[PDB]
Amino acid sequence: IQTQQLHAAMADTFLEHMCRLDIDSPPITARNTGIICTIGPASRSVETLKEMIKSGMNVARLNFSHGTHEYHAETIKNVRTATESFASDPILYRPVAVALDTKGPEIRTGLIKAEVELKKGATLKITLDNAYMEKCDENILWLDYKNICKVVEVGSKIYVDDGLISLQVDFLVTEVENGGSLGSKKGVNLPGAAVDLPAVSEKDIQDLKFGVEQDVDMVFASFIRKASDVHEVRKVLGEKGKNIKIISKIENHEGVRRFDEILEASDGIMVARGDLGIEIPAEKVFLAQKMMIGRCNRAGKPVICATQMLESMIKKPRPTRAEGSDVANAVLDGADCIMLSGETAKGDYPLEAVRMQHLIAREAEAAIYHLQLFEELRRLAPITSDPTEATAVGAVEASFKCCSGAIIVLTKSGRSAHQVARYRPRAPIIAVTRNPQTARQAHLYRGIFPVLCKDPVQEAWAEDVDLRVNFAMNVGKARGFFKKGDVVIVLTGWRPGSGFTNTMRVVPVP
Amino acid sequence: IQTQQLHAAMADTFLEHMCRLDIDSPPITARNTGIICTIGPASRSVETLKEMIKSGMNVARLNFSHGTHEYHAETIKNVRTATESFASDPILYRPVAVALDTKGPEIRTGLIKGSGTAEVELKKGATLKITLDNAYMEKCDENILWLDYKNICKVVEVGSKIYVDDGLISLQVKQKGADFLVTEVENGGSLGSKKGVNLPGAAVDLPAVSEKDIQDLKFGVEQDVDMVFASFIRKASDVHEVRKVLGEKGKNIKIISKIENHEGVRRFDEILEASDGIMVARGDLGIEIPAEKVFLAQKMMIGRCNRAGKPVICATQMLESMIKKPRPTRAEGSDVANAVLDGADCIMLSGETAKGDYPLEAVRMQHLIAREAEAAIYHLQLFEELRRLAPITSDPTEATAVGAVEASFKCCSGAIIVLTKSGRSAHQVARYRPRAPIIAVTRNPQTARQAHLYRGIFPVLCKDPVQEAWAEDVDLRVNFAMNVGKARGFFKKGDVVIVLTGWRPGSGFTNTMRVVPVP
Amino acid sequence: QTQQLHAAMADTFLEHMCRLDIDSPPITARNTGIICTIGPASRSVETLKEMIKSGMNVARLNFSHGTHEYHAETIKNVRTATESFASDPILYRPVAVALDTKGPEIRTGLIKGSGTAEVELKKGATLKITLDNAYMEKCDENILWLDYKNICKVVEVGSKIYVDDGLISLQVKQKGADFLVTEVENGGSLGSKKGVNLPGAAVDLPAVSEKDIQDLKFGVEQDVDMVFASFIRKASDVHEVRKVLGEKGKNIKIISKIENHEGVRRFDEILEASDGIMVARGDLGIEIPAEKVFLAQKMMIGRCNRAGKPVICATQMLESMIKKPRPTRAEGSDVANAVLDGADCIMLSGETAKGDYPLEAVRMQHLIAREAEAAIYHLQLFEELRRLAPITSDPTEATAVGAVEASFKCCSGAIIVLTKSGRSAHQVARYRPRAPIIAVTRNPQTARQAHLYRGIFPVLCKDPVQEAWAEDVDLRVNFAMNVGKARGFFKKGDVVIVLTGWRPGSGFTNTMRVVPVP
Ligand SMILES: O=c1cc(Cn2cnc3ccccc32)nc2ccccn12
Ligand SMILES: O=c1cc(Cn2cnc3ccccc32)nc2ccccn12
Ligand SMILES: O=P(O)(O)OC[C@H]1O[C@](O)(COP(=O)(O)O)[C@@H](O)[C@@H]1O
Ligand SMILES: O=P(O)(O)OC[C@H]1O[C@](O)(COP(=O)(O)O)[C@@H](O)[C@@H]1O
Ligand SMILES: O=P(O)(O)OC[C@H]1O[C@](O)(COP(=O)(O)O)[C@@H](O)[C@@H]1O
């Protein structure tokens, strides 16, 4: 009772559950929320990447907004070098995924003449004549988006340089709402506009093909506005990249409004709060965040909460109180993963930022009101004929009933473990696979602790099944998830191959 | 249904309620969560203060860790000048409370090279000597660090961790002494003048109410402050000590206990029972206990305060980046919204308003987020849990209060108008957390100021003289609240409001609830 | 410790049941309306006086038998007995009068010219049904006449015909022009003028017959409070009853009796058209399989509670009490479960109309209802009623829920409501408070009709209108404090909820006061 917030777990109301949250109730070792770190000058080396892994990084994120293919290939090579330095012990080997975050379509201003000053309620004309592209000034500004006039109307706002400058409407004349240092080749945002820019730009096609060649596990597809955008990303990945997960980045009003069709078309979602906070009033981000996490939990699809989670840690070795809170509340909301950008890419304390996310995520997971969450997940999920779905909900129920140390799932593609994860058990889900890509991808789903079996396939299938379950038991005992004599849930299928999980057993730890 | 997250309000589950939160669903005009602003050099002028009031500032906080009595007396004077500049129209006047935040049992360093602005870059693994010899109190550098805690050597042992400046710098006690400590820099950084020192493992024996606190509390009574935010409250006896120090002259001053250490969290229940309200003082609390556990202590304290109907304040680094930037980080927007969703009565600004470059933008942002987050609350579960967890009582006032809240949800009322002398009647309504704002009409200026501590209370100060016929005096205050609500856009003619009154004059007779249309 | 308050606290319905305590005694107040059928056993002014002391609230008159002259004398006896208590207005109890229509009944003739003669019908035997009026007073074990002329047209070979509360069942073997050769499936004693059911048949009889029209017009003339309309199959049948009552009987409550398949299938349209429902289990249990009646009952009680319209549970609730002074366990359970289901009223037919223990049956209904009312899981019920209730702009609906909420919070002795038309008290009753609703009115029809709503205890104020309106309000509130104190619903110092309006007349209820009992 005095550990894992188990007194708070027993509350009959959410109010009382909150009243019982105890700073003296220590959490277990298992940390269920996946940690995604953006790699950069502060974290690119092998030595550092080894420490990143030890501190808790599960996914290495490569930002293709900048850098060449050569640079990115070397980052990937470094990640795999640091990752396989741990391969010698398969019991302790932690798989590490590689994510490719696309540049995506963007609106950029021209070259000035370099800085200029804009003020109060002055005038500035927006032109598209590619003769003014080299002569940007205080009275006239050129843009690379030719359909800007079609998507904007009388009273529409234009945001310049990550929202620093505000403006009001073959050309458009604007009245400055908020001035400042007008730079050259700066990003432009169109709030409320149904931007008709390509789903995937020319550079993105090249990047996505590079990703297939580099054997990446997932793509974080930028500026996803509709279902067709996801379909274009999927078509570019083709047959060679059919198994690569697609996470759609919701960055503007359109993406939020057309969310249900994007979720159905995608493998998962990223709440890209940075871009979203420029596109929608910042006081509304928390709404879009809580709506997307809720709907992803409802569909059983992975959701990533991103941007400025521990921002002050770029310069400081400890985060602010708002940051500590933001990480906890993203876990409490129901986010599968939490992300680090500048904090691991450019900052002075990358390792400390990763360690803090791990500590907060672990305390937040014990703090979840599983009693309400599990009843609501059950009530909202459809009654289907699927044997694996019934098995998965059965296992979660059994794990709550006997307070099991884990739910051991045998999986080839990962699907069987994903089905367990959508019911959010408190027990860690040990997914035993032989597929190295599945083990990497499994980090996207809350609760899943992926373990790669390297043992050779036995000829008697029932013995091969037993070998993989025993492996999971060994990983559990070694990492102190449970010990000999404890009860665990074990999920297996009625024959080899995917799609047959239908067997739930309550097994003592040997 | 398309406004105030009413589609989300209708959800049968919390998960579905979250699924329905809509960025395109605009909130009402009224903002329920009170905004406390620390007043410092960036916000002291009458000019700025008038604009703070307009931006949404409800309480002016005075941090007695710094500044002389003369400085604070002038800040208070300027707060009153800005507030009274709006008194010509009683319909548009907004009361503004004055809060005195004590220094308390603080441990502080001296001056780096005799300058209150100079800094030293401390290196990891480096040796630093801590002295109590006042010869170095202005001669601090990268080798010698003076602090004002005379009994440091007794309560600290070898291996003990010493945190400096919001715990950003860390040190380990390597060799103990009589008035000195030989330390090893565990975590480096830039060390400035007069920084905060924490000793999480140590049994700090500093008095509850210091000699400086007694002088400041006295000045608070003389200055007619509305509340005291008492630093480092550890047990109920500490609250009792503040209460006894304020004595008879300060008996109506509200005491808010600041929980910022492990003992305070541990002995929370007895502290709460003794206090008029609580501050979740996350700054120190996040140094004293592991920073990852702060959200647990925060939600336990908000829940327990909500369960007890006593005000709770969420404080520190809520919009921190805004000291230097005109826009907050996404983590900051989140924190503000989540403090409101948790059930915090008030939210607070420190350096963001006291010394930052954008104090009005920080006030405006807290106002914008709070109002958005108030509509996002799951009132269906919150009101059911508040009802079930509250005892059955013979108190007529409590029954009227819950009946009034029930009526306000049924007709989606524009407000709950409450006539109150002490504030109690409006406090009893706030406890049940209605969606509609509570317009508290009072003739007592202190009540009007102190009501800002409670979620939803929109206090109004009636200046109209007392009429011969009591029933006409009652109707005059109700009409005054009708006038305020219309003028501020909380409602318009024909809308329905709830009205709370008593059956005779004086406090304690609230027993009448009326459902009336707006004239 | 009292009125199942320990079970009231339960966080789950399962634990609510676990905590039900036979040693937790109920309050004095009984909220469920008791409807009694008047007959030879209960017609005397002297018996009617005792029926009123036992707890009868509504006197039901079955217009399937008797003449207008006979029914007018019944109504006179009910009024004489009710008005005997008017000497003390504190103890006076309003009593309503309900007219129950004959509707499209199908009845057999006389057994060998006698009203009491019986024949033994044996299983396997042939029975000939005739429409020939030469046999209307010559029924026996071989021939049986019935008054439904178009019986042959609506039935077929193989069809089943039920006689006498469905105790005798016949199977049609041969169909004819004005006859039916049948076989005895369920035998027994066949008596005179027994009711007939044709479960599968499309009975074409009118919803409102000429006799029904006369009875309905007589209802208006006799100033009845409500009508119980038999065999209502659709909305158009209720509109037919409504039309007949017309402007003169516009304020007479229509309670549609659901006693057939079509009535259940069309229930929503029926309920929208009506002022209330009777779950008419007798004929319903013959018209549809008997094992489905509880389903229909719970569906109808639920939908009426959801619509805020009165619902009556009727027929064979304490049947064995016709011949015995105590009921069976099933009968005790049935009365308890109708109250638990949410029925506003419970009814007695044979038990009060012709049985040997009428006063006993009324007393028993009173004792069970009171026990069952304390057993209600108010915590879930109030939460569900609020959730399923729409958000209104109506100040009166907001004041009513506020008052119910306030009554739960302080566990008040009562919710005192001042009402002209009764609407304000009905709005309080739709939220099911635990506290009894003392509805103070000066309108006598309002006071009588208030018995149709769970929890309403109507009191008729005799006192003339005081000059100052506030004083007239206070006089009526004090009258309720006096009724509640005399009936032992509360004592001095207890807390009660008071509901009034801001000006005289109907529709201004907007004031809720929490006041100590003087
Ligand atoms: O009733 C509540 C209230 C809250 C606080 N909260 C956190 N995001 C919120 C979004 C909207 C409303 C309240 C919100 N969280 C939970 C969690 C589980 C069950 C019930 N909950
Ligand atoms: O809230 C209720 C009320 C009732 C009716 N009922 C039947 N025995 C009862 C005993 C006491 C109170 C109500 C009772 N049944 C259920 C069934 C499932 C869930 C909730 N229920
Ligand atoms: O989650 P997935 O990809 O459907 O895989 C689960 C599969 O794994 C198994 O447990 C074992 O299959 P293999 O022996 O082919 O690995 C199957 O019985 C089951 O259908
Ligand atoms: O909240 P409090 O301090 O009890 O004050 C509420 C009081 O205000 C009133 O409505 C009006 O009283 P006054 O006329 O004395 O101000 C009382 O009837 C009621 O008891
Ligand atoms: O229930 P109804 O028919 O709306 O009547 C309730 C009415 O009774 C009153 O309390 C008293 O009215 P009277 O003084 O006219 O009898 C009104 O203020 C209120 O509107």
Is the beta carbon of B396 within 6 A of some atom in ligand 4? Answer: no
Give the DSSP letter of residue A376.
H
Give the DSSP letter of residue A510.
-
Q: Shortest CA distance to A334 belongs to which of B5, B378, B22, B15?
A: B15
Write the residue in A18, A281, A322 that is nearest to B331 by C-beta: A322
How many angstroms separate the CA atoms of C99 and A325, rounded? 69
Contact A165, A179 (CB under 8 A): yes
Burial of A463: CB neighbours in 10 Å, binned 0-12, 13-18, 19+:
exposed
Residues of chain C neighbouring B10 (CB-CB closer than 8 A): none
Burial of C492: CB neighbours in 10 Å, binned 0-12, 13-18, 19+:
exposed
DSSP-derived secondary structure for C154-199: H--TT-EEEETTTTEEEEEEEE-SSEEEEEEEE-EEE-SS-BEE-S
Is the beta carbon of B469 within 6 A of some atom in ligand 4? Answer: no
Nearest residue (by CA) to ligand 2, atom 9, is: C340
Residue C210: other Cβ atoms inside 10 A: 8
Contact A476, A429 (CB under 8 A): no
Q: How far is CA A9 from CA A299, A489, C487, in A?
A: 25, 20, 48
The position carrying tokens 């009490």 is: C321
Active site positions of B, annotated: 61, 108, 258, 316
For residue B168 the two structure tokens come to 């950003």
Total length of chain B: 519
Q: Shortest CA distance to C52 belongs to which of C468, C451, C467, C378?
A: C451
How many angstroms separate the CA atoms of B408 and B400, rounded? 12
Q: Is C472 annotated among the ligand-binding residues?
A: no
Return the HEC string of A250-312: ECCHHHHHCHHHHHHHCCEEEEEHHHHHHHCCHHHHHHHHHHHHHHHHHHCCCEEEECCCCHH
> Known catalytic residue: A61?
yes
Burial of B504: CB neighbours in 10 Å, binned 0-12, 13-18, 19+:
exposed
Q: How far is CA B457 from CA A248, B9, B428, B438, C360, in A?
A: 43, 21, 11, 5, 58
Asked: is A31-104+199-364 a CATH 3.20.20.60 domain? The reply is yes
Contact B349, B318 (CB under 8 A): yes
Closest ligand to the CA of B419:
4
- What are A303's strand-pairing partners? A269
Total length of chain C: 518
Pairing status of strand A140-142 against strand A337-340: unpaired
- What are C145's strand-pairing partners? C130
Q: Shortest CA distance to C315 belongs to which of C287, C290, C350, C342?
A: C350
H or E, element range at B61 = strand B59-63
Contacts of B47 (CB under 8 A, 6+ apart): none
Atom of ligand 5 nearest to the CA of C473: 14
Specified resolution (Å) = 2.3
Query: Which is it for the CA torsion A111, A112, A116, A122, positive or negative?
Result: negative
Beta strand residue intervals within C191-343, DSSP E: 196-197, 226-229, 253-258, 276-280, 311-314
- Interface residue of A275, A286, A365 to substitute, partner B, most B CBs within 10 Å: A286
How many angstroms separate the CA atoms of B297 and B293, rounded? 7
CATH fold of A1-30+365-510 reads Pyruvate Kinase; Chain: A, domain 1 (3.40.1380)
Chains touching A by CB (3 or more pairs below 8 Å):
B
The secondary structure of chain B in percent helix, strand, coil, rounded to multiples of 5, reads 40, 20, 40
Q: Do C495 and B394 touch (CB under 8 A)?
A: yes
* Torsional class of C455: left (φ above 0), alpha (ψ -120 to 50), beta (otherwise): left
Instruction: List, in sequence order, the alpha helices (H) in A381-435.
Output: 387-401, 415-421
Q: Shortest CA distance to C505 belongs to which of C472, C463, C482?
A: C472
Q: Do B187 and A317 touch (CB under 8 A)?
A: yes
Closest ligand to the CA of A21:
1
Q: What is the CATH number of domain C1-29+373-518?
A: 3.40.1380.20
Task: Count Cβ–Cβ pairs < 8 Å, chain A vs chain B.
Answer: 210
Q: Do B300 and A18 touch (CB under 8 A)?
A: yes
H or E, element range at B389 = helix B379-389
Instruction: Tell me which method was used to determine the 3D structure.
Output: X-ray
Burial of B489: CB neighbours in 10 Å, binned 0-12, 13-18, 19+:
exposed
How many angstroms separate the CA atoms of C151 and C178, rounded? 8
CATH fold of C30-103+207-372 reads TIM Barrel (3.20.20)
Residues of chain C neighbouring B515 (CB-CB closer than 8 A): 395-396, 398-399, 402, 510
CATH architecture of C104-206: Beta Barrel (2.40)
For residue B129 the two structure tokens come to 């000597």
Q: Shortest CA distance to A105 belongs to which of A225, A244, A253?
A: A225
For residue A17 the two structure tokens come to 């559950």
Q: Is A275 annotated among the ligand-binding residues?
A: yes
The position carrying tokens 């409004």 is: A257
Contact B209, B241 (CB under 8 A): yes
How many angstroms separate the CA atoms of A42 and A38, rounded? 10
Query: Which CATH number, 3.30.420.40, 2.40.33.10, 1.10.260.40, 3.30.2350.10, labels domain A105-198?
Result: 2.40.33.10
Helices H, strands E: what count in chain B? Answer: 19, 22
Nearest chain B residue (CA) to A26: B293
Homologous superfamily in CATH for domain B1-30+374-519: Pyruvate kinase, C-terminal domain (3.40.1380.20)
Is the beta carbon of B378 within 6 A of some atom in ligand 1? Answer: yes
How many angstroms separate the CA atoms of C500 and C439, rounded? 11
DSSP-derived secondary structure for C478-511: HHHHHHHHHTTS--TT-EEEEEEESSSSTT-EEE
Q: Do B389 and A359 touch (CB under 8 A)?
A: no
How many angstroms separate the CA atoms of B224 and B99, rounded? 10
Nearest chain A residue (CA) to B384: A13
- Tell me the domain boundaries of chain A: 1-30+365-510, 31-104+199-364, 105-198
Residue B401: other Cβ atoms inside 10 A: 30
Q: How far is CA C59 from CA A40, B486, C256, C450, in A?
A: 89, 54, 17, 14
Write the residue in C395, C406, C513 that is nearest to B402 by C-beta: C406
How many angstroms separate the CA atoms of B196 and B163, rounded? 8
User: Helix or strand or coil: residue A329?
Assistant: helix
Residue B100 Cα to chain centre, angstroms: 11
Q: How far is CA C46 from CA A125, C81, C359, in A?
A: 100, 7, 12
Q: Do C401 and B393 touch (CB under 8 A)?
A: no
Q: Is C506 annotated among the ligand-binding residues?
A: yes
Q: Shortest CA distance to B196 belongs to which of B63, B25, B374, B346?
A: B63
Q: Do A298 and B21 touch (CB under 8 A)?
A: no
Contacts of C245 (CB under 8 A, 6+ apart): C216, C219, C220, C227, C252, C254
Pairing status of strand B180-187 against strand B169-176: antiparallel
Q: Shortest CA distance to A39 belongs to which of A82, A9, A2?
A: A82
H or E, element range at B70 = helix B69-84
Closest Cα of chain B to A244: distance in Å? 27
Chains touching C by CB (3 or more pairs below 8 Å):
B
For residue A510 the two structure tokens come to 């040997």
How many angstroms separate the CA atoms of B266 and A24, rounded? 9
Class for domain B31-104+208-373, per CATH? alpha beta
Write the residue in B392, B395, B407 that is nearest to C398 by C-beta: B407
How many angstroms separate the CA atoms of C155 and A106, rounded? 79
How many angstroms separate the CA atoms of B141 and A91, rounded? 50
Contact A104, A221 (CB under 8 A): yes
Contact A63, A102 (CB under 8 A): no
Contacts of C42 (CB under 8 A, 6+ apart): C36, C48, C51, C352, C353, C358
Contacts of B186 (CB under 8 A, 6+ apart): B124, B161, B170, B171, B172
How many angstroms separate the CA atoms of C211 and C204, rounded? 16
Query: Which CATH number, 3.40.50.970, 3.50.40.10, 3.50.50.60, 2.40.33.10, labels domain B105-207?
Result: 2.40.33.10
How many angstroms separate the CA atoms of A241 and A234, rounded? 8
DSSP-derived secondary structure for C1-25: --TTHHHHT-SSHHHHHHT--TTS-
Is the beta carbon of B501 within 6 A of some atom in ligand 4? Answer: yes
Contact A413, A432 (CB under 8 A): no
